[PDB]
Write an enzyme that holds these catalytic residues in place. Structure first.
Site, PDB file in Angstrom:
ATOM      1  N   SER A 159      17.568 144.294  17.531  1.00  0.00           N
ATOM      2  CA  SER A 159      17.012 145.436  18.245  1.00  0.00           C
ATOM      3  C   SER A 159      17.930 146.659  18.209  1.00  0.00           C
ATOM      4  O   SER A 159      17.445 147.756  18.449  1.00  0.00           O
ATOM      5  CB  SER A 159      16.689 145.086  19.681  1.00  0.00           C
ATOM      6  OG  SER A 159      15.690 144.101  19.746  1.00  0.00           O
TER       7      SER A 159
HETATM    8  O1  LIG Z   1      17.135 141.977  19.377  1.00  0.00           O
HETATM    9  C1  LIG Z   1      16.330 141.586  20.456  1.00  0.00           C
HETATM   10  C2  LIG Z   1      16.828 142.138  21.719  1.00  0.00           C
HETATM   11  C3  LIG Z   1      16.337 143.092  22.527  1.00  0.00           C
HETATM   12  N1  LIG Z   1      17.203 143.243  23.533  1.00  0.00           N
HETATM   13  C4  LIG Z   1      16.986 144.150  24.640  1.00  0.00           C
HETATM   14  C5  LIG Z   1      15.873 143.700  25.591  1.00  0.00           C
HETATM   15  C6  LIG Z   1      15.023 142.605  25.342  1.00  0.00           C
HETATM   16  C7  LIG Z   1      13.985 142.267  26.206  1.00  0.00           C
HETATM   17  C8  LIG Z   1      13.750 143.001  27.376  1.00  0.00           C
HETATM   18  C9  LIG Z   1      12.633 142.658  28.360  1.00  0.00           C
HETATM   19  F1  LIG Z   1      11.634 142.080  27.717  1.00  0.00           F
HETATM   20  F2  LIG Z   1      12.938 141.796  29.334  1.00  0.00           F
HETATM   21  F3  LIG Z   1      12.046 143.735  28.921  1.00  0.00           F
HETATM   22  C10 LIG Z   1      14.587 144.101  27.626  1.00  0.00           C
HETATM   23  C11 LIG Z   1      15.642 144.474  26.743  1.00  0.00           C
HETATM   24  C12 LIG Z   1      16.560 145.665  27.041  1.00  0.00           C
HETATM   25  F4  LIG Z   1      16.160 146.222  28.174  1.00  0.00           F
HETATM   26  F5  LIG Z   1      17.824 145.240  27.263  1.00  0.00           F
HETATM   27  F6  LIG Z   1      16.679 146.696  26.126  1.00  0.00           F
HETATM   28  C13 LIG Z   1      18.232 142.431  23.403  1.00  0.00           C
HETATM   29  S1  LIG Z   1      19.494 142.231  24.448  1.00  0.00           S
HETATM   30  N2  LIG Z   1      18.010 141.726  22.268  1.00  0.00           N
END
Ligand SMILES: OCc1cn(Cc2ccc(C(F)(F)F)cc2C(F)(F)F)c(=S)[nH]1
Length: 252
Positions: A57
């Protein structure tokens, strides 16, 4: 593709090797920081820092920039409607703009942007940006534990150069990207950044936190990568915050 797993290019910059093994604990990985004022790099675990991994991400930074540059989204309207598909997090189950999509790491928003970007544009951009192995593979979620890889050292260099050099990206796009990345602001600093987390067979495999900090005195680009232990994005963030606090970069 033999040394496409590794960033070999020498640093023709001042750099200081760090020891942050205490803060990393039982996690394995690296930390890289760059100071605009010193024009210098600070590196923990230079060997790990040059191994290329999937950006996960963290690559949403670049999908955001490409979207803005191609006017798929803009400052008048970056809103995208839910596809009425139920995700296990209600933050995803609704309309998004760039800020909510980045804050909540909403995969479908960034996928929809990627779908509207011609592969030839992406290949031009990755080449000009010097983005890692520049390997687009199948060109389907290629940034998510797939063909594209980038090292921790390169995460800092590439982001700093994209944001701070006069290139073909507009100031307005950089500003909107920046706004989407803001995490913390107080009297001493502004902290911007993005997590990434890879999962392979139900285990954390790949953790990132890439970003930058503006203080009264300087601007620092940084990234933490975790390859083992509990290698999640959240953990990479916590470690990053510990290291930056210790170094005096964060106060309050
Ligand atoms: O590569 C995948 C990945 C994404 N993130 C951020 C992530 C993932 C899921 C959710 C939520 F689904 F819970 F909303 C919020 C976020 C964030 F808010 F931190 F950006 C990470 S850490 N790893």
């Amino acid at each position: 593709s033999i040394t496409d797993y590794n960033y070999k290019k020498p640093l023709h910059n001042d750099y200081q090797i760090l020891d942050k093994s205490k803060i990393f604990g039982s996690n394995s990985g690296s930390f890289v920081m760059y100071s605009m004022a010193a024009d210098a790099y600070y590196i923990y675990n230079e060997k790990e820092s040059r191994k290329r991994y999937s950006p996960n991400s963290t690559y949403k930074i670049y999908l955001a920039m490409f979207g803005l540059d191609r006017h798929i989204i803009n400052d008048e309207n970056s809103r995208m409607s839910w596809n009425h598909k139920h995700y296990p997090f209600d933050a995803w189950n609704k309309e998004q703009d760039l800020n909510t999509a980045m804050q909540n790491s909403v995969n479908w928003y960034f996928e929809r942007i990627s779908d509207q970007i011609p592969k030839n544009y992406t290949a031009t951009q990755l080449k000009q940006l010097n983005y890692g192995n520049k390997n687009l593979g199948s060109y389907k979620s290629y940034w998510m534990e797939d063909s594209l890889k980038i090292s921790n050292l390169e995460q800092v260099i590439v982001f700093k150069n994209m944001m701070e050099q006069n290139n073909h990206f507009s100031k307005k796009a950089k500003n909107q990207l920046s706004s989407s990345l803001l995490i913390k602001k107080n009297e001493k600093y502004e902290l911007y950044g993005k997590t990434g987390t890879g999962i392979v067979n139900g285990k954390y495999n790949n953790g990132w936190f890439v970003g930058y900090v503006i203080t009264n005195h300087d601007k620092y680009y940084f990234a933490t990568h975790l390859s083992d232990g509990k290698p999640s994005g959240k953990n990479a963030e916590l470690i990053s915050e510990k290291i930056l606090k210790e170094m005096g970069v964060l106060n309050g």
